[PDB]
């Protein structure tokens, strides 16, 4: 209308967009800063960045942009674009991204009394420290440090308001716990003026239903097939072909983990310890299997039991496991044939007890390795904090 | 011409590109918003974004850009570039992308009576929630929330017009169902002015011919080779080398699925349940195979049938399966040789019935596992909604 | 010089860069549009885009930028940068890229009589439909739709000139066939003015020397090793270890194809059909091998030939394949030993004919599967159109 | 100072940044163009681009930017930013990148006599043709075509100066040979004015120490294990399990090569021919191994030597290889037992000579395949040009 | 306030942002340059770049921007944005990135006496030379060359101040050692004016806890399973199936290393030498295993010991290893049977000593290969400098 056009011509008369809008150049300008988290787009572990879509809320006052509604009965609010009125230069300190602002400057609301409101939307890529420890059951605390870059505490008194999460669109993978905030003022090497800033800590918990179903459960079940080697009879030449196949094919899990873990030499992830533990157990099974196989094909008449394994694996362990173990010329020739058969029976008896001694080790190590696996998987997986919370919330 | 040059010099005289073009600063300016979907470029499941190429249709009126054709007989339409006339700041709220506008401002058509038309093309990357449940047979609903960012309901009365799909260039992978739209006005924490907005919901159905031919059909056929272990004779030492090879090599399918599924701990995909089901069936085959192998190489004269498997696998299951199962010195020596052979025949008879008992388990488990596989694959795959529609449209 | 400086000061006097340069505001301005393809950078199949480096040729006339050489003896051509003279807004409609123009505005040549020439270089990423059918032997037709965005047929009469390929720098992978063009005028929902546009169809043929040497030839040779299972004697326990190794290791080819094929559920690629065909043939070999192995270890005295395979695999197929197949006490004991040996010979004879019956199946299936493979590979590979052209141009 | 401020106010008085700085508008303006290569960042083979970090050296004269030092005793050089003085529009023609200039306009040095110097730094991504032939031992020639885009030969006489490599920071992977340059003037379809341009050809040699240690040497050593199959005794059922394991696991090398080779159907890389050659040799070993295994388990009394292999593999090849190869009732029964044993010895003798005949083939093919491998690896690897230079410079 | 608005109108009166702010145009302007490292974002080995987030500290003086506080009692500091006051053009020389500045120009602090301070934040991607030698235990020295691009030593006297690391946010993967700096002045081909510059060398040490736990430790343990082949009895046909499985499956480690090592043909990485060493040791085990297997299945009556291995592996090595090794017609027939058995015993005795001779080689090579592995792994891993420091800091 005619009044709005007239008002706009009067507000920008002798207006300098470089000066602070204070009426007295001795008191700081109070700027109220806030934040609104809209969603957590992606939390990259390798690059240790946090990509979020948030809004900002800057609110200050302007002494020069003032008018009364009596002279302009229709207009109660005017809007100035970027570059025509003074705005604070509050920006993210971390800003792990190519261009450093990431604010998408929009129009600036102006009151009927000079109060100024500014709501810029942007996608921020801050740099926070991802702690890969108790990795499937970890809680992350990523900081968001906001503050003015050129105005000190004597010019721009930056206040703070509580963060707003009214509308969050849950990410699904990360469970938001909260977002508390602080205002603190520090000192720097450039200047004696304190520089106040506001830091919003984003606390979020990882939902462990996905990884524990794709990395933990399959690892337990597949590693259980290595315990099945001790049930194969030694006659079927497949004991080594089963133990070595499972062991060397279970490596694919850590190749998946290597694509998720940052190469940080600071803390060993729990999933790495548990994956490392299940390799040694399977690896030791192959070592024990070889010990069994050399008792089976012992090639008798080339040694004897040292009477020490005679009482251990045949007397004590065998029961506790409950396994329970011219005619003279013609006469000389037929006697030799019978004597040859008798010696073969004695050789078969010695070879028979060696085979049973290899069966005791299979049954003994089946129970020894079974208890080793269950108390190790439980011990590692329960060792993490808030593990009972993680399974009571996602699984149950 | 001379008239067009004269008209352009008159329209921008005392024209302010910051004021609303209304003639009375008390009524809202009606802006008609529409949309035209041109193609769905890509639907990323991992990042949960939607990249589309669409046009926009903004249509309002301007009180100041008015003239009569009598004075200017030749010109009936003038065009102003970005930054010289007032335009609404309607933008996508979600805008999961670095720069937030994505509109590629073009020329603005101007009527002979002041009506304004604006048709900006752009490629929009919105953030919608991808629901990975019944994944090969899922229907997605992605929102497109458009609305003014600085003008409230009392200044910019944003109306809505139906979306246009006259020319869609079908994507091939995604089948478009429709695109309905709404206009709603909400309240926010900044202001008491309601902020109307228009939301276009993009409903699209995934064509399941590709994945079901590259992930479902090959999985069924390859998993059928694990059922072939029960047909191998136990003499060929390859029963374990066949069951363990198929099981550990079928893992490559989920490595492909892991590259498509977002790491969302909210719902288990159907293709994950069906892939998990076909691993346990194959995994249980190896466990059963080991049970068979220890009946084959039973090493007789070290145990006896407990008369419980004597009647089950040899009497009941065997029939229902229909398998149907100085001379004295010389005399003493030859008698021993015959007696040795007689004992060997008795040992061979006992070992023979153990081998047949292992054949009954192969035939029994062949039928038990075959019915387990067919009713599980059908049960999981039919469990999804609109599955009959998905196969009647893409396959048939 | 002094004349060029004087001329430049006269041309921009009272010049408006927003008006059409026509002298009468009732006739359209003729704009001649052309194109020059310089190289095809990349044809992405997954994203269905076409990245090309081309030049543009816009040619119109300007009524105001006119002067005579008599007054300015030295200058015959002036050049204006972007934003100082009127230029048409012709742009690519498809433009599957973030920023939509992709033209890199340069200087604009100006005649001595007002004729205007404009040659902008740019790298265009258009969206065309990639048809993955007869994939190694396919010909693609990608469109390039150019036209004005704000001027209709009554204001900007867009003409067309033939595309120029004088200098093409052949891509090596794609063989260019031609690039014909059209001009057509359509109607839209906004306006009653027809909007003429020019479409250049890029026709290109894929050279099939690379893929057919890295995907087709190796697949044929490796799949031929599955036919080698029928030559192994059954005594060497490696028949299953050879058939199952080749089958499960040939999967790597489709993992390579999956990285090239777009996930389009519209047409099955020929290379997918041929790769699927060679899996079933190899897969059926393992099924047949198991049938052979159970004839070898038949465990006689537990069944007999049903006299149906007695005449087929032993009488008909065996010939057409041409394989050609106190003294009394002592007397009783030695008689038993001889009788025991006689029964063993009868048991060995029955087991011998079972082994030969397994050899007939190996020789019979060797010829049955060999003819199955050759007529299937030839049948699928010849089924594609312009296949003889593809091998006569690239291979020969 | 006061003189520099005064001089700057005088130089931009009545100065037009659009006119050529010549004093007479009839002679071309001489522009001296040069180049300085600073490093070769990356040479991508798949996309056929060349990313280099180079400087430019443009040097012309300006008639209007002239002054005497007597009036301004302090200043001898002034600097104008981009957009205030006339600069040539020399740009890279190839420019395989999104934005086409890639020059990062900086300040422009100005002489005390009008001579102008301009040194813009930039990272250029040009499109050159990568020839993958003799791939580990190839030399590439990438062009850099620079020239004006809007000024012809009658306006901007573009000269050339030799390229400067004083400071190159060697890349490590690519060995620079030289960078010669040319100036040539061509004709185009737009205009009759010749357009001179300068082309700098970047000649560079690939260092072959890396690939030949990670692709060539490991391939030779691993392929040598396939020759070890002929030393295994046939009793150990692992001949097929060794030949088929090496063959199907050596495929990983070409999967690495496929990630480096562009999909160009123009020339077969040498490393592809050598990798293809070592597959056929290993593949033929498995075929020969099967021929051996059917001589070992020949199942005698089912055939006889055709007297042709009797003299070849047992008489000629065996020596040149130097391998050197009531009482009557009782009497009848014992005679049968002895006769049964005698027939078994005759059957064992026939089976023994079949096994030795399989040993001759192992020893014969061990020498036949060994000479096949050495003369093929040497023949392919020496076939490339400048191969002796490549090994005398990098290895030795 | 009124004074700040008045002051801003006076400072930009007759102010030229192109002239140097010196009062006498004969002395250079002293500019103090510094740097503050905030974190090391990523050190890419393949592309040889260094992405860091740092601040800059430029400090000079301005003669024209001076005023007294007496006239303006309130304001003591004014701030000018980019493009309104003179600023030096100091920029990174290396700048391995698309856009070359990477400085994110901010406001410029102005003193009450003319001293100027400028603190631009930016993320810099410099190009330094990554030396992949002693790769897990390497220390890198990356340069940061800063200097003016258009002002020489006679105009801009660039000084230097020590780098500041007060607040570093340790990266976790890289351990910072220090960041010393230099100022040097060189000569170039353009000009006779020396161009001073400041170079900051970033010295950083890689923490070796991650790789040595994921690449070194697993390689040692897995390679130890190849030494387990010498403990398997030869009767179980799995010696080759174990040696060849470990060898061909250990290749996955270098596929991981190939994704980290730049393709530089300048220095062989230590981890590559150690991975190459552990392949030959495992590869030689398979060669030795084949030698053992041909002693086991020696097929006697086809050769004899040459009396050279009779004393080595049976007399010397066997002890040092301590292994310790009508009646006439009836009479003729039974005599033949006994004689046949006697010849079999003599054939079994000869075959028995061949099998034991194969056991000596297993025990001899078990000790020979065990000492080969330990002294090779230790020798290679200790060969690197500062290896004891790397394990005393990260592991211990
Ligand atoms: C390669 O590493 C894996 C291994 C796996 O086992 C073999 C799985 N299997 C899996 O996750 N199955 C289920 C079950 C439910 C419920 O959901 N998913 C996945 C990966 Cl990635
Ligand atoms: C690795 O996972 C796969 C496994 C597969 O089986 C082995 C296939 N095979 C396939 O898809 N064959 C056909 C048939 C038709 C018709 O089209 N394609 C593909 C993948 Cl990706
Ligand atoms: C594929 O190459 C690997 C091989 C591996 O062994 C099989 C591992 N295993 C591993 O790292 N285990 C541990 C132990 C601790 C403590 O932390 N991690 C990893 C990779 Cl990448």
Author numbering:
A (entry chain E), B (entry chain D), C (entry chain C), D (entry chain B), E (entry chain A): 23 to 347, 432 to 502
Original paper wording:
The homomeric α7 nAChR is among the most abundant subtypes of nAChR in the brain. Five identical subunits surround a central pore axis with 5-fold symmetry, forming a typical pentameric assembly. Each α7 subunit comprises an N-terminal extracellular domain (ECD), a C-terminal transmembrane domain (TMD) and an intracellular domain (ICD).
PNU-120596 (abbreviated as PNU) is the first reported α7-selective PAM that could increase the peak current of the receptor evoked by agonists and delay channel desensitization. In the EVP/PNU-bound α7 structure reported here, PNU is unambiguously assigned and found to insert into the TMD interface of two adjacent subunits. PNU interacts with hydrophobic residues in M2 and M3 of the (+)-subunit and in M1 and M2 of the (–)-subunit. Specifically, the larger halogenated aromatic group of PNU is in close proximity to T273, M276 and L277 in (+)-M2 and F275 in (–)-M2. A hydrogen bond between the carbonyl of PNU and the carbonyl oxygen of L235 probably provides an additional stabilizing interaction. L270 separates M2 into upper and lower halves, and the upper part also displays a slight clockwise rotation. These rotations expand the channel pore near L270 and the upper part in the PNU-bound α7, which is in contrast to almost identical structures in the ECD, the ICD and the remaining regions of the TMD in the EVP- and EVP/PNU-bound states. In the EVP/PNU-bound structure, the further rotation of L270 (9′ position) side chain leads to a marked dilation of the upper half of the pore, leaving the region around –2′ position as the only remaining constriction section.
